[PDB]
């Protein structure tokens, strides 16, 4: 029968016009049951309806419709592990949001996707139910009720087929852990698939670096306990033999640079095949071709493995592709940071030839800024251009503000409270401002730094620093005196190699020495300063205003910041008071720490450390005793009490500020002193020379899984602090404190590891050469921040 009008009872979201036109029918056409069914099927195929009931009341097709209800609210119950935010984001991934229609067909897929997310997280018992509560006006409240369950953790990572290396040794380098000791910080036993793949590639690297060019990971089984609480990772490998690298033969499109590449692909006579070295020379060929203007110099090293001689011939197919030029480098997401802050980290120049190495260097430099959670790159191709690209750096800004509160404890500083508030990207300008503070047993420090990391485009940083320092010497195991200092330092740090960094600065420091214990060395310095106090009146006072030119040179070629195994860190830091200061003196310091690995795995290292220092007045004056050098404690000479090494305080007879018999009150007259007296308390020296041969060895009685997480070492520390200005002629009864020959020595064991409480550094050192007065504490330790 003919159809004239189509009613749409039940429509409240799809416009009657839209619903009508979505049906492939126009008014005035002949409709039979076949056409009715076809219209129903198409109208429901529009994906807006959950019930179509076309009625024939009278001569009009009353298209009764049940509409796809709108999601009134998305709620979550039982998702304790995961906050609602990422749940809602993963819902948006499926287009499910408050105000969107609930199709009732994808919710099963959505809860299945949530369960898949949980299974990735490791909660393999996780359950998700999408309950729908009807609400008036055709609405549904979607309650995603979760039963996360226990997160499965790796009970065992097993390698089958490893005979050249123990399973523990191989697994130690995996970011998936089957054992996480409480005392150590090795990681978590949680399992992620991407971590499993990264660990398989770590195993590949481990074996290909030792010459196992035929190494192959036959399979990787991941098993669950029936309770789905434990995960077992079995890596079935077939490590071949150790293959030698006979030679590297290069071919392809070398762009006329075959000579330089050939000099790059030079190997020792039949060395041991090393996948790391092969990739290193591939990257060196990439760098060479990039320095020749090639943006994407592809270099594929295929090893032709001859099992007969067990050798490898590296066919390095090199295709130095086209030259692409960066029309412009864009930054997306630098809403806080100004453009120059991101752009001055670009090693790739805009308006230059593209180098993938340079673009990745810029990306990693942007990551190193710390201003961004993510820094992706996109070398988009300029429209209608064969060789022009835009390098878009899509960053996502972080909260560069950070307040830290650390607590450490050590035999040196006692309880060390550190606090701080830092803005590393002040107003997105790249200025790192921040107020820090420290509180040891003996020194309360409070700093306010403001460093422009790029005072010059070249990277020369300029940093001001307002410091305050209340140093109670007696708490530092020195002779009693309280130096309350404060002042400024404006320092230009000049980078010169990315390993060497100079820094020249001008500083002001006002020092107020109070409660100075009457002693020979302090009063020598004070007499040199034109003040003539009395050896009585322990409550002395002395204020100085010193303008210093500080200089510094930090060479830092340590491959690892934590537990270095190779390289050297030298730090020559000096300080010369400029004319116009109250104190006239220079003070040079030279730290050194050379790690020489004596094996292949870098497990056996020799740390040759040294700590030199020399200070002295510039004529008539004398270096302030409070700038003296100290030795002892678990920083210079272990097994010696902090600062004990060196000249000891020669005290004068005086009345004690506090008098209480049976104390000796630092040898006071009121206690029964009448002449100059020696003492066991150190004053430091204007000269200092400390050294330490520390044989770092693998930690013996500990699983290879995390034996590299603990640094064991056996150290021999030399150290002599001396007062070059000591009046040997005038003080003949007392020990000659101007003697560098008084080389204190200690030998001991040291154990470092990154415990949950912080970097723990214990050491037991016996001082086998200590002079009179040198207080020795054998067990040093530091629970650092």
């Amino acid at each position: 029968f003919v159809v004239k009008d189509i009613h749409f009872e039940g429509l409240q979201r799809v416009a009657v016009g839209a619903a009508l036109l979505s049906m492939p029918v126009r008014t005035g056409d002949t409709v039979n049951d076949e056409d009715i069914s076809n219209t129903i099927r198409a109208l429901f195929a529009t994906g807006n309806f959950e019930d179509v009931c076309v009625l024939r009341d009278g001569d009009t097709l009353l298209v009764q419709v049940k509409e796809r209800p709108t999601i009134a609210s998305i709620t979550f119950s039982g998702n304790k592990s995961v906050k609602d935010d990422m749940l809602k984001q993963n819902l948006e991934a499926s287009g499910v949001r408050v105000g969107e229609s609930l199709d009732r067909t994808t919710i099963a897929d959505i809860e299945k996707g949530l369960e898949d997310f949980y299974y990735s997280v490791g909660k393999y018992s996780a359950s998700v139910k999408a309950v729908v509560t009807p609400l008036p006006r055709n609405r549904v409240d979607l309650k995603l009720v979760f039963q996360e369950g226990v997160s499965a953790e790796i009970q065992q990572i097993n390698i089958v087929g490893n005979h050249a290396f123990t399973t523990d040794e191989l697994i130690s380098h995996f970011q998936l852990r089957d054992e996480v000791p409480w005392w150590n910080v090795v990681g978590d036993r949680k399992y992620q698939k991407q971590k499993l793949a990264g660990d398989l590639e770590t195993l590949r690297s481990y074996y290909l670096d030792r010459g196992y060019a035929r190494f192959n990971i036959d399979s990787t089984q991941v098993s669950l306990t029936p309770d789905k609480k434990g995960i077992y990772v079995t890596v079935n490998i077939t490590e071949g033999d150790q293959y030698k690298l006979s030679g590297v033969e290069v071919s392809g499109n070398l762009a006329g640079h075959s000579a330089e590449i050939e000099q790059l692909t030079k190997i020792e006579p039949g060395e041991l095949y090393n996948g790391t070295k092969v990739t290193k020379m591939e990257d060196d060929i990439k760098k060479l071709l990039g320095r020749y203007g090639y943006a994407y110099p592809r270099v594929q090293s295929m090893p032709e493995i001859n099992d007969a001689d067990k050798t490898v011939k590296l066919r390095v197919n090199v295709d130095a592709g086209n030259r692409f030029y960066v029309r412009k480098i864009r930054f997306e997401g630098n809403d806080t940071s100004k453009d120059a802050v991101l752009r001055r980290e670009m090693r790739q120049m805009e308006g230059a030839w593209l180098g993938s190495d340079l673009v990745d260097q810029g990306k990693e430099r942007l990551n190193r800024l710390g201003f961004f959670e993510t820094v992706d790159t996109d070398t988009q191709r300029v429209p209608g251009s064969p060789d022009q690209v835009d390098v878009v750096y899509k960053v996502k800004e972080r909260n560069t503000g950070s307040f830290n509160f650390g607590i450490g404890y050590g035999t040196e500083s006692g309880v060390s409270f550190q606090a701080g508030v830092q803005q590393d990207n002040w107003l997105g300008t790249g200025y790192a401002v921040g107020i820090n503070g420290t509180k040891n047993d003996y020194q309360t420090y409070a700093e306010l730094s403001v460093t422009n990391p790029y005072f010059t485009v070249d990277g020369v940083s300029l940093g001001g620093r307002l410091f305050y320092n209340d140093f109670q010497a007696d708490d530092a195991d020195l002779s009693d005196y309280t130096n309350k200092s404060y002042g400024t330092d404006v320092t230009l740090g000049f980078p010169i190699n990315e390993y060497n960094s100079l820094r020249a600065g001008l500083g002001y420091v006002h020092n107020s020495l109070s409660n100075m214990q009457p002693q020979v060395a302090m009063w020598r310095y004070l007499y040199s300063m034109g003040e003539h106090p009395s050896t009585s009146d322990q409550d002395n006072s002395f204020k100085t205003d010193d303008f210093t030119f500080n200089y510094g040179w930090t060479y830092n070629k340590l491959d690892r910041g934590y537990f270095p195994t190779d390289g050297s860190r030298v730090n020559l830091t000096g300080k010369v008071t400029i004319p116009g200061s109250d104190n006239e003196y220079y003070k040079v310091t030279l730290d050194t720490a050379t790690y020489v690995p004596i094996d292949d795995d870098h497990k056996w290292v020799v740390l040759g450390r040294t700590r030199w220092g020399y200070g002295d007045g510039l004529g008539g004056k004398e270096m302030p005793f409070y700038e003296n050098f100290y030795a002892g404690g678990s920083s210079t000479v272990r097994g010696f009490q902090s600062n004990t090494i060196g000249p000891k305080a020669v005290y004068f007879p005086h009345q004690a500020s506090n008098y209480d018999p049976d104390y000796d009150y630092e040898c006071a007259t009121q206690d029964g002193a009448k002449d100059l007296c020696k003492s066991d308390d150190a004053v430091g020296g204007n000269a200092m020379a400390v050294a330490s041969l520390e044989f770092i060895t693998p930690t013996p009685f500990i699983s290879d899984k995390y034996a590299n997480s603990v640094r064991t070492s056996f150290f021999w520390d030399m150290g002599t602090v001396w007062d070059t200005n000591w009046d040997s002629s005038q003080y003949s009864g007392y020990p000659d404190y101007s003697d560098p020959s008084n080389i204190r020595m200690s030998a001991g064991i040291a154990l470092q590891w990154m415990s949950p409480l912080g970097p723990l550094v214990f050491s037991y050192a016996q001082p086998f050469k200590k002079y009179d007065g040198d207080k020795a504490e054998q067990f040093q330790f530091n629970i650092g921040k």
């Binding site: 950070s402 607590i407 450490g408 949950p756």
Partner: peptide, 7 residues
Amino acid sequence: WNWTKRF
């Protein structure tokens, strides 16, 4: 121990 919280 050092605890760092980013504001």
